[PDB]
Amino acid sequence: TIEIIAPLSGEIVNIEDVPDVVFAEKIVGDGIAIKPTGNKMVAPVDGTIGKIFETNHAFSIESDSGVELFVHFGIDTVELKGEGFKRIAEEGQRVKVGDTVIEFDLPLLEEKAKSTLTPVVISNMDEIKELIKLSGSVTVGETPVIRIKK
Amino acid sequence: TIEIIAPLSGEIVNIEDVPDVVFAEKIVGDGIAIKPTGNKMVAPVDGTIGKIFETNHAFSIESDSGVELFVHFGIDTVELKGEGFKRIAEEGQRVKVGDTVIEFDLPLLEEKAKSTLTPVVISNMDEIKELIKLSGSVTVGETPVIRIKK
């Protein structure tokens, strides 16, 4: 069993409840969303950073275990054109669970973002046998949010 | 060298110009888009169909040559709930280039869909030596759209 650790603090939300079909309908994969309360986003697995959006509000990571994840702050955040976000990590950087990747200005985001719901998804669906979603409140870099069986 | 054949007729477009960050930012893989002008989606390679969306608007195929492709008609098309598409093939079907997978109703979709822009991506990026993107107008199951190595 592989455990995916909270990339940010806040409360776990049903992915299907996200206001974005691309996510709500699992086109890219399945996972969970998080209504944020913190100030940053960390690596949820040990592995390699893949890509970071040029607006720095999203990023992908490859775990050593072989799981591919996509973490996207809020809904339609691109429109914000990078406001309120700072990139910490670098593209193919080698990271560990809890390593900071992006830092955000929530109060600002809460004001200007259409949504602050943050999808955490396994873009790797075919390669995995089973995905178990957890519930409740999570602490950045501490709590499991998803458990998989590969 | 593997040649990816057009899965639909139309005009090649930059993936970066697709109105969807997930695709545009190639989270889902890399490739091209097609502004469709026909009525059907065929196999762009000899391989096996993997998955057909329950809304019959997108599919996965793996070529015999080991390349994994993902053809998704339009943008946000899942929201139409299958309207304008007809699954012709089956998941697991073995196909040859040009075999019909799905037929669609252009005019209907042109009217209802947010966009008819159709990404054609490689989901296997890590397994490929090079991706050479082609240009121009293509004809379903005839005109090569991408050339890959290894």
Residues in B closer than 8 angstroms to A22, CB to CB, are 20, 22, 76
Domain count, chain A: 1
Neighbours of B135 (CB within 10 A): 11
Which H helix or E strand runs over A42? strand A40-42
What domain range is A59 assigned to? 1-150
CATH code assigned at B49: 2.70.70.10
Task: Determine how β-strand B30-36 pairs with β-strand B10-13.
Answer: antiparallel
Half-sphere exposure (Cβ direction) of A83: Cα atoms closer than 13 Å: 12
- The residues, ordered by sequence, that sit 6+ positions from B111 with a Cβ below 8 Å of its Cβ are none
* Pick from A21, A27, A53: CB nearest B25: A53
- A53 contacts in B (CB within 8 Å)? 21, 25
d(C-alpha B103, C-alpha B116), whole Å: 14
Q: Which of B89, B70, B66, B57 is nearest to B15 (CA)?
A: B70
Name the helix (H) or strand (E) containing A40. strand A40-42
Query: Is residue B133 within a helix (H) or strand (E), and if so which, with residue range?
Result: strand B130-133
CB A101 within 8 A of CB A44: no
- b or e along B63-94 (b: 16 or more beta carbons within 10 Å of the residue's beta carbon)? beeebbbbbbbbbbbbbbeebbbebbbeeebe
Structure tokens at B126: 């890590």
Could you give the C-alpha distances from B92 to B11, B47, B51, B60, B88, in angstroms and in order? 29, 10, 8, 10, 13
Phi, psi of A85 (to 5 degrees): -125, 145
The resolution in Å comes to: 2.1
Is residue A23 annotated as part of the catalytic site, yes or no? Answer: no
What contacts B148, CB < 8 A, 6 or more positions away?
B1, B2, B4, B67, B122, B128, B129, B130, B131, B132
Distance CA(B57)–CA(B61), nearest Å, equals 14
